[PDB]
Amino acid sequence: NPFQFYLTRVSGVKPKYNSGALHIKDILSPLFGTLVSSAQFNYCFDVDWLVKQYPPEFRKKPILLVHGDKREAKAHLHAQAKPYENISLCQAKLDIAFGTHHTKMMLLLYEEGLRVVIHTSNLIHADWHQKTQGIWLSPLYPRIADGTHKSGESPTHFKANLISYLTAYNAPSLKEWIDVIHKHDLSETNVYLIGSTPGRFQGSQKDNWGHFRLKKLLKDHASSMSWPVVGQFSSVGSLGADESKWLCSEFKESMLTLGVPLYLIYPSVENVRTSLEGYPAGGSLPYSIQTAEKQNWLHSYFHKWSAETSGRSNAMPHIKTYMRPSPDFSKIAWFLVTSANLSKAAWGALEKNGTQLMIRSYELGVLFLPSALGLDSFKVKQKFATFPVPYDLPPELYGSKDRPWIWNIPYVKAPDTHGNMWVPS
Amino acid sequence: KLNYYD
């Protein structure tokens, strides 16, 4: 199977729905390789939990935690890590306000080679318990032979692009990981890397990151042929006073590039209320009333979470995906799984009369293009050549009584799955 | 950071 795209295991659904699914313990298992060292890029971490996901025999190998925490939060993370002598930390610079280090990636160095995992889950128990999350698993990349002259590069330029992404951190502990990547053969890679890093990018540099990076790839490696754009995410930034300020101007413009209906998928209150977790699923859907009230126009694009295809309608999404289905939703021109939510912070916004792209955050995703497999389009696998779309198509519009889940207002009129109400404060 | 709300 050419995609190597997986969902995480969900507790409390029938076993058949977890058969092709992966838990972090599966990923770190000895069947995947004899572990020597690892790097864990993420946003939230529970270190005690994380160490327990490694198999006992690998639990004392060096682990590098790449995080964005500052001040007190940084002090607390160092304190959780201290007991574990084998753990080092790298604080990613966040020079721009309201930026986060949001990338979820594992670099796994083995005796037998190197693996890269790009995924959507925080390193905390609740992200891997009852949520819909996505994982891309690289192949086992072998070491380049001791006396040989090869680039180890793929046709998608994945090796160079990943080194460029790590190089932007300007961090000593990542230079060692960059050197490790240099030494391995990543030529089998069939996905394109799409990254965001904090900065203001001018001229040629605009194409390197965020939605301009996606636009550049779609221009160069997709062919044109009414095909909608679908975006599916778990956090929503401040998008502006109306659809023309960013969403439908620069953002949709990048997404529809090749060589238009826009569907946005985001859980309603009813989706959350009746989920496996109930209202506490909302702790991972942090759309605030302060943001929502500025942009009620956005909610007309909102569609329900529905995932009968993967038995996950009650497993709230923390995966983020973007794609370009045909008018009948039976094929797609491309698919993207990423850490990037629907925000300018993650995707970039144009500044200074459109000569500057400003990005607040670190994000990372992988783009699946038919051309990378010698195809023109992918057929959609109707039941999770054939791409496994993890949710139902076509997406269903919010009903007249539906509202977007907003995490910081109370819900006290109907109890959730576990008989509880939601009263933040 | 242990989760989104701290």
Among residues A154, A169, A190, which one ends one of the domains? Answer: A190
Beta bridge partners of A114: A109, A141
Q: Is B1 helix (H, G, I), strand (E, B) or coil?
A: coil
Say how far apart CA A368 and CA A336 lie, in whole Å: 6
Query: Looking at the structure, do residues A87 and A184 belong to the same domain, yes or no?
Result: yes
Helices A172-182 and A158-167, interaxial angle, to 10°? Answer: 170
For chains A and B, CB pairs below 8 A equal: 23
Rounded to an integer, what is the distance from CA A418 to the centroid of its chain? Answer: 29
A126 lies within 8 A of chain B by CB: yes
Closest-CA residue to A100 (of A193, A237, A279)? A237
* Technique used to solve these coordinates: X-ray
Chain A residues within 8 A of B2 when measuring between CB atoms: 44-46, 124
> Chain B residue with minimal CA distance to A286?
B4
**What type of residue sits at position A27?**
I
Spatial separation of the C-alpha atoms in residues A2 and A370, rounded to whole Å: 11
Cβ-Cβ contacts under 8 Å, A43 against chain B: 1
Residues sharing a CB contact under 8 Å with residue A420, sequence separation 6 or more, in sequence order: A278, A279
Here the tokens at position A57 are 């025999």
Q: Kindly state whether residues A186 and A219 are assigned to the same domain.
A: no
What separation in angstroms does the CA of A99 have from each of A22, A34, A95, A154, A384?
A: 30, 36, 8, 31, 34
User: Do both A129 and A250 map to the same domain?
Assistant: no
Which pair of tokens denotes residue A419? 């008989």
E-strand stretches of A339-414: 349-351, 356-359, 363-368, 378-380, 386-387
For residues A244 and A338, membership in a common domain is answered with yes
Residue of A nearest to B1 (CA): A44
Residue A254 shares a structural domain with residue A402: yes
Q: Do A157 and A210 fall within a single domain?
A: no
Last residue of a domain, one of A190, A223, A242: A190
User: A140, A155, A190 — which closes off a domain?
Assistant: A190
Contact B4 A77 (CB under 8 A): no
Residues A204 and A224 in one domain: yes
| Number of Cα atoms under 13 Å in the Cβ half of residue A259 | 5
Tell me: do A77 and A209 sit in the same domain: no
Asked if the Cβ–Cβ distance from B3 to A283 is below 8 Å, we say yes
Domain of A239, in residue numbers: 191-425
A129 is catalytic: no
Taking an 8 Å cut-off on Cβ atoms, the answer to whether B5 and A283 are in contact is yes
- Asked if A126 and B3 come within 8 Å (Cβ–Cβ), the reply is yes
Residue type, A274: T
**Chain CA centroid to CA A119, Å:** 5
| A39, A50: one domain | yes
Cβ contact A257:A215 at 8 Å: yes
Q: Are A152 and A184 in contact (CB under 8 A)?
A: yes
Residue A76, min C-alpha distance to chain B (Å): 8
A104 among annotated binding-site residues: yes
CATH number, domain with residue A393: 3.30.870.10
Q: Are residues A271 and A214 in the same domain?
A: yes
Q: What is the dihedral of CA A390, A126, A20, A107, to 10 degrees?
A: 100
A-chain CB neighbours of B5 within 8 Å are: 283, 286
Judged by DSSP in three states, A68 sits in coil
Residues A159 and A207 in one domain: no
- The answer on A34 and A2 residing in a single domain is yes
The resolution, in angstroms to one decimal, equals 1.7
Number of domains observed in the structure of chain A: 2
* A149 is an active site residue: no
- Quick one: DSSP state of residue A422? B
- Residues A288/A406, Cβ–Cβ less than 8 Å: yes
DSSP assignment of A131-151: SB-EEEE---BPBPPTT----
CB A87 within 8 A of CB A65: yes
